[PDB]
Amino acid sequence: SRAAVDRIIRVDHAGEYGANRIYAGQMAVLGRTSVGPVIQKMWDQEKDHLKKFNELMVTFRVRPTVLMPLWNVLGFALGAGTALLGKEGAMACTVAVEESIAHHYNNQIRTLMEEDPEKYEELLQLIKKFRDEELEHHDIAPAYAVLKSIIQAGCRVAIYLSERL
């Protein structure tokens, strides 16, 4: 059973790392403008989430995914790839990545309450609070509705590879 909770922490760590990196890229490109201060709050939120999941990963002696040096050049290329198209390539990347994160948080909180709902809640309340804080500002053009989907598909494939490898 320890190898069942040994997968959710790794995937959450990897996803939060990717999101932090994306926001770092977008802040590096759109830094000194009228929209910079909006991305700073999200970047700080994600740094906080990453520190929490990092201490939680150090505690349970988890194994970090081996692909982490690859989300470091692909988490920054989608921070200058988008966000150079104006404030429509930025509003469409954060929404997509945060919807993907919330969807996977729901999928995790499903299979952890129907299998063993009492050997936990030192961790499950954390997942619930993180889902709430991640979906609070994910709610805030027929062509962008395809860019968002083709970003969500990538952010959903990169989670399925980071579980096993």
Partner: protein, 179 residues
């Protein structure tokens, strides 16, 4: 999360009741709570798949009594596709929008799994006991016959979609001749 999702199910089921003038948008989902929008379409597709399964089962438990005749695989597959497509008649004007939603590059796994399960539950009742590579070909050889046919029904204007059914003939015959 048991006494709340069992009510979201009823929310969706009552919301998709009146969509002839409101579209699959995120407002007819809430306008139905008085009594993109991918979850609604996926729920409707799952429900129609389950009802097709149940109808085929009620029909299957009618030949063990000697009351209904037997048909070859041709007629049975034609009738199965026909009675599955005849559920899209009320929601025919706002269908292409939902079909677009179902084909976005991040909804393809779910829709493809639903299509595969439908094709499997449609082939299994037509006496298919095969454990080979033929388990795949036949399945695929039917999925096309479905998808293509759908892309005609949305643009047909003939009385009672008669034209469409004719196409089905000229698409299953050439299929059952090793096509």
């Amino acid at each position: 999360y048991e006494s709340e999702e069992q009510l979201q199910h009823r929310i969706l089921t009552a919301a998709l009741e009146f969509v002839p003038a409101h579209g699959w948008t995120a407002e007819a989902i809430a306008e139905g709570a008085q009594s993109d929008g991918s979850e609604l379409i996926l729920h409707f597709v799952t429900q129609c798949n389950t009802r097709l399964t149940r109808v085929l089962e009620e029909e299957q438990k009618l030949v063990q009594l000697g009351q209904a005749e037997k048909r070859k695989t041709d007629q049975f597959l034609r009738d199965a596709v026909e009675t599955r497509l005849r559920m899209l008649i009320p929601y025919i004007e706002h269908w292409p929008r939902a079909l677009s939603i179902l084909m976005l590059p991040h909804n393809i796994p779910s829709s493809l799994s639903l299509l595969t399960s439908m094709v499997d539950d449609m082939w299994h009742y037509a006496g298919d006991q095969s454990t080979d590579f033929n388990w795949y070909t036949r399945r695929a050889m039917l999925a096309a016959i479905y998808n293509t046919t759908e892309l005609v029904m949305m643009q047909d204007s003939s009385p009672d979609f008669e034209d469409t059914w004719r196409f089905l003939e000229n698409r299953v015959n050439d299929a059952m001749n090793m096509g």
